[PDB]
């Protein structure tokens, strides 16, 4: 699903 | 462009105007009631350290609860923080206000970056990042530029104005915005080192110069805040104009590393030229030159990050912000102590950090060539 998750200090895009 | 992106950029700009507001007044603030330069550096250092401490928790919270709500709460806390600064009278209340403001900034920014990344497709994850960089630099430069100006009448309302601006940003953002783990292990982090040190250097130099300039020029030439205002505004405008209207022209005839090295040499020479100057008009002219020098490096570093990251632009955009905060925290804290031990020491450390950057550029380039 197009949605971003937050790791430490940066966002990363779901597959 | 959709207005939502405009307001998301305006939030960044407001945060970095808050981070830069204090500098114009800095001498008269605490050399009228009996403080020293150490705490003058410590104030802005506390702001940036609060930002650093708080960004992870704020990011995570925002991810687990929402972005618009976090952004609005952040803006509210920033406005409250900035209004608290304008009513304090001792050092502890000012320290608490700066820490609160750091908190608001560090839990604002993750929401704004998340929303921008969520609204920009894969074809706009570079142009919008460049716009973010540009807005951050413009806000940081123009913070003092406007904070000096209205300080001349009713001294204690450049934070009143900032508070009012902040609540306006709050209400505009809530009304208009229509928004109802092992990845590291793979990473070699053996190429990311030199862009990280370069952005650390650049942030250190810019923040330390901004911190030391007001104190030095008020001590030697007895600058009123109007003079510091006009110097910083002119500097920033000249640098931004030279950037926008000649960057593409210089890229055709150099490489990124050589461009950065020559810009750094230009910066280090203009700093000593500033040291030797002892006149009002002279030191007024040197500001334009020094900001022209400092405005070139940042886009080169952003392009370097973009070209090395490849697909995962978020990682580079996060490292850039994290180490920009690192520089913004470590610069003024050292600069205050250096201005305490001597008068010309902060410029000497600026020289040193710039030459450091030159040397790392040189070594990096040498070992890529070999």
User: Running DSSP on this structure, what letter comes out for residue A14?
Assistant: -
Q: Provide the token pair at B359.
A: 């040397």
The helix/strand/coil state of A6 is: strand
Strand bridging mode A4-7 / A10-13: antiparallel
**Chain B environment of A7 (Cβ under 8 Å):** 181, 183
User: Running DSSP on this structure, what letter comes out for residue A10?
Assistant: E
* Spatial separation of the C-alpha atoms in residues B67 and B111, rounded to whole Å: 5
Q: Provide the token pair at B36.
A: 């020293």
User: Running DSSP on this structure, what letter comes out for residue A4?
Assistant: E
B118 touches chain A (CB under 8 A): yes
- Per-residue H/E/C for B154-190: CCCCHHHHHHHHHHHHHHHHHHHCCCCCCHHHHCCCC
The helix/strand/coil state of A5 is: strand
B179 touches chain A (CB under 8 A): no
Residue spans per domain, chain B: 3-180+183-369
What CATH number is given for B3-180+183-369 in this structure? Answer: 1.20.1250.20
Contact A8 B321 (CB under 8 A): no
Contact A12 B62 (CB under 8 A): no
B24 touches chain A (CB under 8 A): no
* Spatial separation of the C-alpha atoms in residues B267 and B280, rounded to whole Å: 20
Task: State which approach was used to obtain the coordinates.
Answer: cryo-EM
- Cβ atoms B295, B242 nearer than 8 A: yes
Q: Which of A6, A8, A9 sits opposite B114 (nearest CB)?
A: A6
Resolution in A: 3.3
Find residue A11's DSSP bridge partners.
Answer: A6
A14 touches chain B (CB under 8 A): no
The helix/strand/coil state of A12 is: strand
* Spatial separation of the C-alpha atoms in residues B8 and B101, rounded to whole Å: 18
> What is the interface size between A and B, counted as CB pairs within 8 Å?
40
- Per-residue H/E/C for chain B: CCHHHHHHHHHHHHHHHHHHCCCCCHHHHHCCCCCCHHHHHHHHHHHHHHHHHHHHHHHHHHHHHCCHHHHHHHHHHHHHHHHHHCCCCCHHHHHHHHHHHHHHHHHHHHHHHHHHHHHCCCCCCCHHHHHHHHHHHHHHHHHHHHHCCHHHCCCCCHHHHHHHHHHHHHHHHHHHCCCCCCHHHHCCCCCCHHHHHHHHHHHHHHHHHHHHHHHHHHHHCCCCHHHHHHHHHHHHHHHHHHHHHHHHHHHCCCCHHHHHHHHHHHHHHHHHHHHHCCCHHHHHHHHHHHHHHHHCHHHHHHHHHHHHHCCCHHHHHHHHHHHHHHHHHHHHHHHHHHHHHCCCHHHHHHHHHHHHHHHHHHHHHHHHHC
Query: How many Cα atoms are found within 13 Å in the side-chain-facing hemisphere of B359?
Result: 6
* Spatial separation of the C-alpha atoms in residues B42 and B31, rounded to whole Å: 15
* Spatial separation of the C-alpha atoms in residues B60 and B98, rounded to whole Å: 22
Q: Provide the token pair at B138.
A: 């413009």
Q: Provide the token pair at B85.
A: 């600064």
Helix (H) or strand (E) holding A13: strand A10-13
* Spatial separation of the C-alpha atoms in residues B126 and B103, rounded to whole Å: 28
The burial class, CB within 10 Å (0-12 / 13-18 / 19+), for B90 is: exposed
A15 touches chain B (CB under 8 A): no
B119 touches chain A (CB under 8 A): no
The helix/strand/coil state of A7 is: strand
Closest of B38, B351, B27, B19 to residue B216, by C-alpha: B27
* Spatial separation of the C-alpha atoms in residues B45 and B53, rounded to whole Å: 12
For residue B136, give Cα distances in angstroms to B102, B126, B151. 15, 15, 23
* Spatial separation of the C-alpha atoms in residues B216 and B33, rounded to whole Å: 19
CA B339 centroid distance within chain = 21
CA B370 centroid distance within chain = 35
Find residue A13's DSSP bridge partners.
Answer: A4
* Spatial separation of the C-alpha atoms in residues B47 and B49, rounded to whole Å: 6
Contact B319 A10 (CB under 8 A): yes
Contact B55 A10 (CB under 8 A): no
The helix/strand/coil state of A11 is: strand
- After which residues does chain A break, using C–N > 2.5 Å? none
* Spatial separation of the C-alpha atoms in residues B361 and A4, rounded to whole Å: 35
The burial class, CB within 10 Å (0-12 / 13-18 / 19+), for B170 is: buried
CA-nearest residue to A4 within chain B is B118
């Amino acid at each position: 699903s197009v949605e971003n998750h937050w790791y430490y200090f940066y966002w990363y895009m779901s597959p | 462009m959709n207005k939502q992106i405009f307001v998301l950029y305006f939030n960044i700009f407001l945060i970095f105007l808050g981070i830069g507001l204090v500098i114009p007044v800095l001498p008269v603030y605490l050399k009228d009631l009996g403080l020293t330069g150490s705490d003058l550096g410590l104030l802005v250092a506390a702001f940036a350290l609060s930002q650093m401490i708080i960004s992870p928790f704020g990011g995570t919270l925002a991810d687990k609860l929402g972005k618009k709500l976090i952004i609005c709460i952040g803006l509210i806390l920033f406005s409250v923080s900035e209004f608290m600064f304008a009513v304090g009278h001792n050092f502890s209340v000012l320290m608490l206000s700066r820490v609160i403001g750091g908190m608001s900034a560090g839990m604002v920014m993750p929401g704004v970056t998340g929303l921008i990344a969520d609204i920009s497709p894969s074809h706009q994850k570079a142009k919008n990042f460049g716009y973010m960089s540009a807005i951050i630099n413009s806000g940081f430069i123009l913070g003092p530029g406007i904070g000096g100006f209205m300080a001349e009448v009713s001294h204690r309302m450049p934070f009143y104005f900032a508070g009012a601006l902040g609540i306006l940003a709050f209400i505009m953002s809530i009304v208009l915005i229509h928004d109802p783990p092992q990845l590291l292990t793979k990473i070699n982090w053996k190429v990311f080192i030199t862009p990280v040190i370069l952005t650390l250097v650049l942030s250190f130099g810019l923040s330390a110069f901004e911190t030391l300039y007001s104190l030095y020029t008020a001590d030697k030439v007895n600058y009123s805040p109007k003079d510091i205002s006009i110097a910083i505004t002119g500097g920033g405008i000249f640098g931004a104009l030279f950037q926008i209207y000649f960057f593409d022209k210089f890229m055709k005839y150099f490489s990124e590393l050589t461009f950065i090295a020559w810009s750094l040499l230009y910066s280090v020479v203009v700093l000593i030229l500033l040291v030797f100057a002892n006149d009002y008009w002279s030191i007024m002219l040197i500001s334009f030159v020094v900001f022209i020098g400092f405005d070139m490096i940042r886009p080169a570093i952003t392009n370097y990050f973009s070209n090395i990251a490849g697909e995962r632009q978020g990682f580079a955009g996060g490292l850039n912000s994290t180490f920009t905060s690192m520089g913004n925290f470590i610069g003024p804290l050292i600069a205050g102590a250096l201005f305490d031990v001597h008068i010309e020491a902060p410029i000497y450390m600026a020289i040193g950090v710039s030459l450091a950057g030159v040397v790392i550029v040189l070594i990096e380039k040498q070992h890529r060539a070999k």
